[PDB]
Paper text:
Additional to the canonical GST-Ω class carboxy-terminal CLIC domain, CLIC6 endows a unique amino-terminal, predicted to be highly flexible, which exhibits poor sequence similarity to any known protein. Similar to other CLIC structures, mCLIC6 can be subdivided into a TRX (residues 363–442) and an α helical (residues 456–592) domains, connected by an intervening linker region.
We report the crystal structure of the mouse CLIC6 canonical CLIC domain at 1.8 Å resolution, which reveals high homology to the canonical structures observed in other CLIC family members. The structure of mCLIC6 has been determined from two crystal forms at 1.8 Å (P 21) and 1.9 Å (C 1 2 1) resolution, respectively. The overall structure, in both crystal forms, shows two nearly identical mCLIC6 subunits forming the asymmetric unit, each with 55 × 46 × 26 Å3 approximate dimensions. Comparison of the relative chain conformations within the asymmetric unit yielded a root mean square deviation (r.m.s.d for all 226 Cα atoms) of 1.7 Å. However, overlaying the TRX or the α helical domains separately resulted in significantly superior alignments, with r.m.s.d of 0.6 Å and 0.5 Å, respectively, indicating an intrinsic inter-domain flexibility leading to structural plasticity. Examination of the structure using Adaptive Poisson-Boltzmann Solver (APBS) showed that while most of the surface electrostatic profile of mCLIC6 is negatively charged, the inter-domain cleft, formed mostly by the amino terminal half of helix α1 from the TRX domain, and helices α4 and α6 from the α helical domain side, demonstrates a positive surface potential. While this interface demonstrates highly hydrophobic surface properties, close inspection of its structure revealed a single inter-domain hydrogen bond, bridging the putative transmembrane region (PTM; helix α1), localized to the TRX domain (Q383), and the C-terminal end of helix α8 of the α domain (T577).
Residue numbers in the entry: 359 to 403, 412 to 596
Amino acid sequence: GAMGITLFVKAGYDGESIGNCPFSQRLFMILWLKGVIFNVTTVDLNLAPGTNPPFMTFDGEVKTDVNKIEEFLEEKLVPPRYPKLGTQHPESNSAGNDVFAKFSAFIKNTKKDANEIYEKNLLRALKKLDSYLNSPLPDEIDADSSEDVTVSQRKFLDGDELTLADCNLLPKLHIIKIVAKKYRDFEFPSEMTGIWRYLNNAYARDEFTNTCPADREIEHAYSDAAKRMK
């Protein structure tokens, strides 16, 4: 029978390479971090007609919905052969969960008179995430620091290891960073040092950097943001 895992992802514009999709990147990262053998098939145009292309076969069985695939992988790939990637702190699963939605409304808005509201809503969401990244978690200890630790030095959302929460959020933050810069000259504010520490830590991980689609894929996917504000 069909055995193993195949992840089907959106193809880029060349019809063969990885295209823009935060959901595909999320699953790519999970499978990488699991240490499981898998292949990635790009989709270039028993599964329903026109199902949206981030899906997976597991021993031949088709699995849909990015959230359900995550839950299935975390439940089927377990120690000792595969690590658990679930978070230890429940707040890690909700931190910044509105950021991508607010960015989407900001970047898709056409009316200039509404930009201040959408941009401020984005900044408010980012502030909340930055606060979580900079506030030490309760169990956090800096064993090597004689001084008191007021700004968290942990690498990622939940601690020093990448978890499912990072696989969800990091692809979205990567899109925001590329698109908002290209089309709005908008950047994560310099005072949000938690977001910037987090991104610097993440871009130093092969599992994040080498699952990012090319910048031009992401910029092309959002090419409608180059239109004038009416």
